[PDB]
Design a binder for this molecule. Structure first.
Ligand code: MYR
Length: 188
């Protein structure tokens, strides 16, 4: 919902292994306009490959993300959510903390007030848990059985209020201050 959030994505999707040149401003107009035209975020293969190709030229249409697309695995009309695919992409690439956070909170801060609800947290945790294959999921600890018990706990951690709201700072200071949340929000 803002060019700023585009920057955070630049450095992130940049160190990953690709190399997008489009400044953060471009992703801003493209992102919104992209989800604005689509229904809610459902895209097809013929379309995704085109986005990953332009976003990352020197990287081969099958370098890293090649696996991600597999994890999701379509299952209806041959389409898949894009927003989730993105968040998943970013969250898990393995990197600093506040980097993926401030980006996640800003990503949900579309254009209205300036806060995020529990249901939103769950959506994210669902994006990563799904990003994981039912095979590597058996290795995860027991305190992560499902995005439901994992999101609820996180909420009872920095939320301090059942079904409440988190502000930009709160969210950040919530993961940085408490190590648990940080380990319950940033992938493993
Ligand atoms: C508000 O306008 C949020 C804008 C965020 C833009 C960065 C996300 C767009 C890049 C997604 C990467 C997809 C790789 C195929």
């Amino acid at each position: 919902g803002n060019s700023k959030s585009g920057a955070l994505s630049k450095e992130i999707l940049e160190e990953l292994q690709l190399n997008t040149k489009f400044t953060e401003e471009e992703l801003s107009s493209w992102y919104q306009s992209f989800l604005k035209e689509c229904p809610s975020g459902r895209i097809t293969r013929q379309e995704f490959q085109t986005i990953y190709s332009k976003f990352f030229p020197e990287a081969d249409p099958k370098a890293y993300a090649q696996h991600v697309f597999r994890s999701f695995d379509a299952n209806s009309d041959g389409t898949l959510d894009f927003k989730e695919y993105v968040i998943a992409l970013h969250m898990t690439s393995a990197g600093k903390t506040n980097q993926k956070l401030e980006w996640a909170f800003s990503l949900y801060d579309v254009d209205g007030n300036g806060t995020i609800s529990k249901n939103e947290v769950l959506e994210i945790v669902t994006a990563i848990f799904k990003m994981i294959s039912p095979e590597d999921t058996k290795h995860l600890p027991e305190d992560e059985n499902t995005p439901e018990k994992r999101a609820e706990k996180i909420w009872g951690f920095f939320g301090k209020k059942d079904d409440d709201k988190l502000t930009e700072k709160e969210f950040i200071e919530g993961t940085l201050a408490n190590k648990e949340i940080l380990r319950l929000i940033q992938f493993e």
